[PDB]
Enzyme design. Structure first.
Site, short mmCIF file in Angstrom:
data_model
loop_
_atom_site.label_atom_id
_atom_site.label_comp_id
_atom_site.label_asym_id
_atom_site.label_seq_id
_atom_site.Cartn_x
_atom_site.Cartn_y
_atom_site.Cartn_z
N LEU A 18 -16.56 49.07 54.65
CA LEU A 18 -15.58 48.17 54.07
C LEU A 18 -14.56 47.63 55.07
CD1 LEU A 18 -15.18 50.22 50.80
CD2 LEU A 18 -16.08 47.91 51.03
N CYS A 19 -14.08 46.41 54.80
CA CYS A 19 -12.93 45.85 55.50
C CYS A 19 -11.67 46.15 54.71
CB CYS A 19 -13.10 44.35 55.63
SG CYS A 19 -14.26 43.87 56.87
N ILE A 20 -11.06 47.32 54.95
CA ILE A 20 -9.81 47.68 54.28
C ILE A 20 -8.74 48.07 55.29
CG2 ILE A 20 -8.89 48.90 52.27
CD1 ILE A 20 -11.64 49.79 51.59
#
Ligand code: ATP
Ligand code: MG
Lengths: 177, 995
Positions: free
Chosen positions: A93-95
């Protein structure tokens, strides 16, 4: 003085807290793999609110924790990679919440970063909140991003097919909340 | 030679000092007056660092007492000249630095040959002032230093003009700008820190709208919160539009130094302990009185532990205070007991102190040669009287401290014979045999530690010697490269002090879980204490958890460039290392890694990941697929990107090269894929002028729009991507390359790339894995076929590893308009190299051995211990008392949260365990874990609970963890959560099951 307790014990306490039926926290089923590795959780995520586009979907996931918890962050990845604007083929994920800000942190002033004071429930809240309201300041180079941006019907059609595939993995396991 | 630096040797030091600095050092000639411990330690460190030439002056003959701290003198040398017997051994430390000997110094004018002149404790204060006047007025840098027992000082005088070029050595700060206002208020981007202090200077680049503001001009910084600063008016330059990156700059600083005569009366202090501020001025007079004494008494110092001479000195100090009332201050009386201790120890020569000042002074020398870091301005005084043992256990008088015709005579002068004996009979474990480890072993040889009939040293290290280590790990020589550090190092110090011969147990065993059968319950229970010379966090926390279990002291330390620390860990009293550990470097967000980089750190991380993928993971997977006939089952279990593992296999096998030219074509094709097609692909998915989020352009802020690359063999990064890719792929498939023979000729590679066809870029769940299974070759067709995986070695410059990563990173940098970086910067990031120098290493090790003395006296007063932090760049010394252990309370019973534990005999039953804790401790075990596995839980369902509740612990472990407990294991550590009598969860000790 924040987190004097062990790493093993800290994850166990947050595991017991989030698995208590009496507590009843905002819908998240979590159990340890082979009930033996504390540092690797299997997590089923369901969407709370109907207004969001992912409602009524059960997406499984794994959270791997590092030895030095909680002054490092854990890794999160979906056990089936899903059609999301912020999900790569891998499932990662891109978090902003799962990465450290660096240097003297001092105040961690404006928004969303990993800290020792930060909790697992907090990571799970932000995965859901980013799922129900995707973040287009940090998109991923997957087809899902380009489809969300042009806004064709294909985006919501592939969301539905993925929510149907997610519903495909709920009957196995009697107690469905 | 002029303008070259051997990177293979100096790597670790270059990342500390820099190329420019090391080049100025290689033009500078150093002279050191006096070669006892202080001299040889200063000289060892300067010669290792690499100056033009080292010259030593000490004609006096060798004495046995001089062996207290001079590691290069032996018993057999007695009677001879110190310069002559030291010079040859000094010469061995660095073939690039010639070491010479000054026969005579009756002609002061010989000092004109030299650029730095260091005067140690053999030179009178009369002669020091003469030599300094000559240096000060001739433009020569003068440094001076003295050790008196557990006291010491250093004095620095670089002349009327000296220019500091880089004051901290830290990397310059940068940050992306979002707005520049007319008045000069720079607002940062999306919540980034600048990190800039008031009076810093900065330049700007890529600031659109303010043309000549990007041309190198500097702006002084007024800080306005953590996200802004002001730089004066900017109306002349234009009007802000968008974009912009600032960059910090260190400007030169011209500083002036006063002579030694001027500073004896008006000294400028740098303090070594803020808890001992008042002592500085006291010691300044004291140290001068020690010279007035020696003038009066025929050059002799105060006699050891002698009261007559002490009161004489107190007089000399009082008299000097009346000559110099600004130096002691109004209404400030002489600290009679401090001066008294000074006289009692004037003749002492203490390894830990000699090392502290040797390292610090050696560094003041390189600053004198180079203009790197801020010199000490100008005097600094130090004591470690906290090292002295309790007089009751170890009496100090004129009989306990007299000499005994030994090498340890000048240590007895401080501590007493019985105490040196206790040092000798100590049983100690030293984990690691590197830079700190080698300095630790020298110090222990000088102490005689483990030389007694009841004492010994165990030193362990599973690493070998590499050339880059010879710069600070000085017991090793170039002929020792390849050997094991611990064995060469133990042999090395038994040469230095043969009192240690046969008493150092040098192992090549790595300290971790897998070697607990060597390092067993019995191994640890014998030790007095443990000392870490480790360089990684897993080894430090493993040793720490083991010293907590066995309740043994631990001496931890560490260095990063000019910075160091020491930590003391005392059973039942202080915190452990694991408590006060550091947070490893922040992982780079995956979105910035994969699609939107803005730093070279992001292109190197990406390039390493791609190196590991191409040339290691892929070979490992093909060989697993041919060897293990059920690879596909384990890979479907193995969740992560399975289709990419199977595509890696299918690529490796569907198009395998048969000559080097196919490797070349593969490398050019990969260039096209990664830097032309994949970039065009990204641009298709998010167009250059795309205005997605809020109506604002998409590629704004930390997003930089890339441009596909047009291969140009004349571009060095383009060329070396193909050269390295080709040679590494050739390695994978056992294909001989023509470049392993001789170096690569460009026309060769260009002839193959010129006759190549370049595909144009075309822009556009259970069946997907099965068709790939069917396409794969059947292992039976491929006999004896192996792929040779690559093992990333950063320190071999012939092997193409850093070459590829440099090229790959830098090409991607071209893609995103990021400045490229050279081989050395890539090696540093990709290889995660820690900057290291021998000066800091020696200093830190000395401080550690000053805490070791306190351990020998079983001191339990936490305030007597000292944790150190140094930064020799500044130079800064900051000691603090160690943190006491957390405490906790269950049921009004108090316990130590780090060190206390419940001890239970025998492989008890889980039921008897729970019942034992409710009766005896009032705790209701809720959850119980062994290592990484959760064994028992109070919330478990009936079927899970009844099968576990009846088992003994070892069988319970086997049930839950599916593993036998080994026979060597004697004890187990269990963690519990539990409730108290009131039903509230409480934190509680751990459990030690003595089987
Ligand atoms: N688990 C371990 N058990 C025993 N020794 C270890 C362990 N881990 C690291 N060490 C040792 O600690 C030592 C640290 O010393 P140091 O870092 O100064 O040298 P180095 O690692 O060879 O140098 P460089 O950092 O330039 O590669 C090394 O010899 C290393 O092998
Ligand atoms: Mg290292």
């Amino acid at each position: 003085s924040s987190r004097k307790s062990t790493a093993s014990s800290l994850l166990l306490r947050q595991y017991r807290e989030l698995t208590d039926p009496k507590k009843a926290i905002p819908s998240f089923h979590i159990e340890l793999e082979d009930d033996s590795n504390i540092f690797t959780w299997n997590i089923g995520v369901m969407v709370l609110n109907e207004d969001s586009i992912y409602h009524g979907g059960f997406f499984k996931a794994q959270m791997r924790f590092p030895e030095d918890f909680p002054f490092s962050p854990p890794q999160f990845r979906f056990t089936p990679a899903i059609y999301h604007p912020n999900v790569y083929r891998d499932g990662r994920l891109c978090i902003s919440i799962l990465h450290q800000s660096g240097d003297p942190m001092t105040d961690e002033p404006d928004a969303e970063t990993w800290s020792p004071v930060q909790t697992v429930e907090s990571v799970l809240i932000s995965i859901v909140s980013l799922l129900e309201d995707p973040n287009i300041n940090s998109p991923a180079n997957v087809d899902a991003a380009v489809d969300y941006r042009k806004n064709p019907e294909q985006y919501k059609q592939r969301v539905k097919m993925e929510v149907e595939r997610s519903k495909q993995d709920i009957p196995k396991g009697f107690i469905m909340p | 030679a002029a303008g070259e630096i051997d990177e293979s040797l100096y790597s670790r030091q270059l990342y500390v000092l820099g190329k420019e600095a090391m080049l100025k050092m290689q033009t500078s000639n150093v002279l050191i007056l006096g070669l006892k411990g202080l001299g040889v330690e200063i000289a060892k460190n300067v010669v290792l660092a690499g100056v033009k030439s080292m010259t030593v002056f000490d004609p006096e003959p060798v004495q046995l007492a001089d062996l207290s701290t001079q590691f290069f003198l032996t018993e057999k040398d007695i009677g001879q000249k110190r310069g002559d017997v030291t010079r040859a051994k000094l010469a061995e430390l660095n073939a690039y630095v010639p070491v010479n000997v000054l026969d005579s110094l009756d002609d002061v004018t010989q000092l004109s040959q030299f650029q730095v002149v260091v005067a140690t404790d053999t030179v009178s204060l009369e002669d020091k002032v003469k030599i300094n006047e000559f240096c000060h007025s001739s433009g020569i840098r003068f440094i001076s230093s003295e050790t008196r027992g557990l006291f010491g000082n250093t004095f620095v005088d670089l002349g009327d003009e000296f220019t500091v070029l880089d004051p901290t050595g830290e990397e310059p700060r940068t940050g992306m700008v979002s707005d520049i206002e007319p008045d000069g208020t720079v607002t940062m981007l999306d919540d980034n820190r600048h990190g800039l202090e008031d009076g810093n200077f900065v330049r700007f680049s890529e600031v659109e709208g303010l043309d000549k503001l990007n041309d190198g001009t500097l702006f002084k910084v007024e800080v306005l919160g953590p996200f802004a600063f002001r730089i004066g008016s900017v109306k002349e330059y234009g009007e802000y539009k968008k974009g912009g990156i600032f960059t910090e700059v260190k400007v030169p600083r011209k500083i002036s130094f006063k002579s030694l005569k001027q500073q004896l009366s008006n000294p400028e202090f740098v303090f070594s302990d803020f808890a001992k501020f008042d002592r500085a001025a006291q010691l300044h007079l004291g140290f001068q009185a020690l010279h007035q004494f020696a003038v009066r008494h025929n050059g002799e110092l105060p006699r050891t532990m002698n009261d007559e001479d002490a009161n004489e000195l107190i007089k000399l100090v009082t008299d000097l205070s009346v000559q110099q009332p600004e130096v002691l201050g109004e209404g400030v009386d002489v600290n009679e007991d401090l001066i008294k201790e000074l006289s009692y120890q004037a003749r002492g020569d203490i390894p830990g102190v000699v090392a502290f000042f040797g390292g610090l002074v050696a560094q003041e020398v390189l600053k004198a040669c180079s203009g790197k870091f801020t010199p000490l301005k100008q005097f600094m005084y130090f004591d470690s009287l906290e090292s002295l043992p309790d007089p009751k256990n170890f009496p100090r008088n004129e009989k306990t401290t007299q000499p005994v015709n030994s090498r340890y005579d000048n240590q007895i002068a401080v501590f007493g014979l019985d105490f040196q004996k206790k040092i000798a009979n100590s049983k100690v474990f030293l984990v690691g045999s590197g830079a700190i480890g080698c300095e630790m072993l020298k110090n222990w040889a000088l102490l005689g530690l483990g030389s007694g009939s009841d004492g010994y040293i165990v030193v362990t290290d599973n690493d070998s010697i590499e050339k880059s280590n010879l710069n600070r790990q000085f017991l090793f020589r170039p002929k020792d490269v390849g050997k094991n550090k611990s064995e060469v190092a133990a042999e090395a110090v038994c040469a230095m002090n043969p009192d240690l011969k046969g008493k150092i147990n040098a192992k090549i065993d790595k300290v971790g879980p897998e070697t607990e059968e060597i390092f067993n319950d019995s191994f640890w229970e014998s030790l007095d204490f443990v000392t870490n010379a480790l360089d990684n966090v897993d080894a430090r926390t493993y040793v720490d958890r083991r010293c907590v279990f066995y309740r043994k002291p631990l001496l931890e330390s560490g260095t990063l460039g000019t910075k160091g620390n020491t930590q003391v860990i005392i059973p039942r009293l202080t915190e452990s290392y694991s408590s006060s550990r550091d947070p490893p470097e922040k992982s780079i967000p995956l979105c910035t890694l994969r699609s939107f980089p803005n730093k070279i750190d992001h292109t190197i991380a990406w390039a390493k990941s791609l190196f590991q993928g191409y040339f290691t993971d892929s070979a490992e997977n093909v060989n697993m697929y041919l060897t293990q006939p059920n690879f596909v089952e384990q890979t479907l279990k193995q969740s992560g990107d399975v289709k990419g593992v199977l595509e890696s296999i299918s690529d490796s096998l569907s198009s395998k090269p048969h000559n080097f030219e196919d490797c070349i074509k593969w490398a050019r094709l990969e260039f096209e894929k990664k830097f032309n097609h994949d970039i065009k692909q990204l641009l298709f998915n998010f167009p250059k002028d795309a205005k997605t989020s809020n109506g604002e352009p998409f590629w704004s802020g930390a997003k930089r729009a890339p441009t596909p690359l047009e291969f140009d063999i004349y571009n060095n990064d383009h060329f070396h991507f193909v050269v390295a890719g080709a040679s590494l792929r050739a390695y994978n498939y056992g294909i001989k390359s023509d470049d392993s023979n001789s170096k690569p000729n460009v026309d060769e590679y260009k002839s193959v790339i010129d006759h190549m066809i370049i595909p144009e870029f075309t822009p556009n769940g259970s069946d997907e894995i099965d068709q790939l299974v069917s396409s794969l070759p059947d292992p039976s067709t491929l006999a004896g076929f192996k792929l040779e995986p690559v093992d990333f070695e950063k320190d071999d410059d012939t092997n193409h590893h850093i070459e590829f990563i440099t090229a790959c990173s830098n090409c991607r940098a071209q893609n995103y308009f990021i400045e490229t970086a050279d081989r050395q910067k890539t090696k540093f990031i990709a290889g995660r190299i820690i900057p290291a120098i021998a000066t800091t290493t020696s200093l830190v090790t000395g401080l550690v051995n000053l805490e070791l003395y306190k351990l020998i006296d079983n001191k339990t007063d936490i305030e007597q211990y000292k944790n150190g932090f140094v930064n020799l760049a500044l130079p800064f010394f900051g000691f603090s008392e160690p943190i006491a252990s957390p405490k906790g309370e269950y049921n009004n019973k108090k316990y130590d949260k780090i060190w206390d534990r419940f001890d239970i005999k025998g492989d008890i039953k889980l039921s008897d365990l729970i019942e034992h804790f409710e009766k005896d401790e009032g705790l209701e075990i809720t959850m119980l874990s062994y290592g990484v596995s959760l064994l028992y839980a109070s919330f478990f369902p009936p079927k899970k609970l009844k099968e576990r509740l009846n088992l003994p612990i070892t069988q319970l472990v086997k049930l839950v963890t599916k593993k036998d407990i080994p026979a060597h294991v004697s004890t187990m550590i269990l963690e519990i959560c539990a409730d108290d009598k009131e039903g509230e969860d409480v934190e509680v000790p751990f459990i030690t099951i003595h089987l």
